[PDB]
Motif scaffolding. Structure first.
Motif, short mmCIF file in Angstrom:
data_model
loop_
_atom_site.label_atom_id
_atom_site.label_comp_id
_atom_site.label_asym_id
_atom_site.label_seq_id
_atom_site.Cartn_x
_atom_site.Cartn_y
_atom_site.Cartn_z
N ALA C 19 0.83 -1.20 0.00
CA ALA C 19 0.00 0.00 0.00
C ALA C 19 0.86 1.26 0.00
CB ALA C 19 -0.94 -0.01 1.20
N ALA C 20 1.89 1.28 0.86
CA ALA C 20 2.75 2.46 0.93
C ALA C 20 3.50 2.68 -0.37
CB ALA C 20 3.72 2.32 2.10
N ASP C 22 2.56 1.81 -3.42
CA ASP C 22 1.61 2.36 -4.38
C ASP C 22 1.48 3.86 -4.20
N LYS C 23 1.26 4.29 -2.95
CA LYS C 23 1.08 5.71 -2.70
C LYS C 23 2.32 6.51 -3.10
N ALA C 24 3.50 6.04 -2.69
CA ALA C 24 4.72 6.79 -2.94
C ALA C 24 5.01 6.90 -4.43
CB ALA C 24 5.89 6.13 -2.22
#
Lengths: 171, 57, 57, 57
Positions: C19-20, C22-24
């Motif tokens: 998840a992290a 993807d966001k970054a």
């Protein structure tokens, strides 16, 4: 004079070429998901560590619940609002393209129409950029939903953790 | 005459360039999900508040 | 491989890191896109000064 | 002139592509909002702040 105006090299190309914009996307995708620990991709690496730090819930479980529900509602509303405003921008973009085609009819010399062609090419490049931005927004939307799910599961794990030691007291 | 028709600057480009259409998409995506409370993205912030108001049963 | 507890920790770490990541990736890519816009605007600024036909081609 | 016309036509198809992306995002947002309304109704039925119950008479 006219032959010199037609032939030769003008230096355009090697114009704004040193801007390494390929560094804003991963170099290779094998190691994109190993970036947090180090290696892989370093521009995201720092960002990943910051995000993981900021996604950890603190406070009472009730506060966790209120924060998670607020995030869910705000995420849905943000998705909708971004879509709506972007569509308004797209309609204005269509009006601009129609205007550029209106200018195409009045062109007289060859230099004028060549400049108009390059202007329309730049306009296409701008729409390409908006397409990439929309793709990026969709990926961010997906990531946000995943993060909300992760926070939900963290709260669930905290409630049901086997490391808890308390129970009601008879008095 | 033909050389003048081929060479020179005609002003196309700087044509319909002041229309700031980049303002219809978020400037930065860090704060896109903090827009409702204020800051982040002001244009969607008015819309988010309206939507959240209208989605309550 | 390994004990089931190690399997659990590995799976949870993968989920959070995914998840992290993807966001970054999305955030950095958006920064690149905004810089890409600036470059396109610069190229259209160059169009206003073109003089000969070879230059505009 | 025909080349520039075809370029404008390509720009129009680009605009339609962006519009379709925007429609897909709106579709996803609408589904999320419907789910949110479902969960609001569920929370309202099962809320612990409710104080009523049937009366024996």
């Amino acid at each position: 004079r006219m032959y010199e105006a037609v032939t030769g090299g003008r230096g355009l190309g090697d114009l704004m070429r040193n801007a390494q914009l390929r560094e804003y996307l991963p170099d290779d995708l094998r190691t994109v998901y190993d970036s947090a620990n180090g290696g892989g991709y370093s521009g995201i690496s720092g960002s990943i560590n910051d995000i993981l730090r900021d996604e950890r819930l603190n406070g009472s479980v009730a506060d966790m619940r209120r924060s998670i529900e607020e995030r869910s509602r705000t995420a849905a509303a943000t998705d909708k609002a971004v879509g709506l405003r972007a569509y308004e921008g797209a309609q204005q973009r269509l009006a601009q393209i129609e205007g550029l085609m209106d200018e195409i009819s009045r062109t007289q010399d060859q230099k004028a129409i060549e400049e108009l062609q390059a202007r329309i090419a730049g306009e296409q490049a701008a729409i390409q950029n908006e397409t990439t931005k929309l793709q990026m927004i969709a990926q961010l939307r997906q990531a946000e939903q995943a993060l909300i799910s992760e926070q939900r599961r963290e709260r669930n794990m905290r409630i049901l953790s086997s490391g808890n030691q308390g129970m009601p007291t008879i008095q």
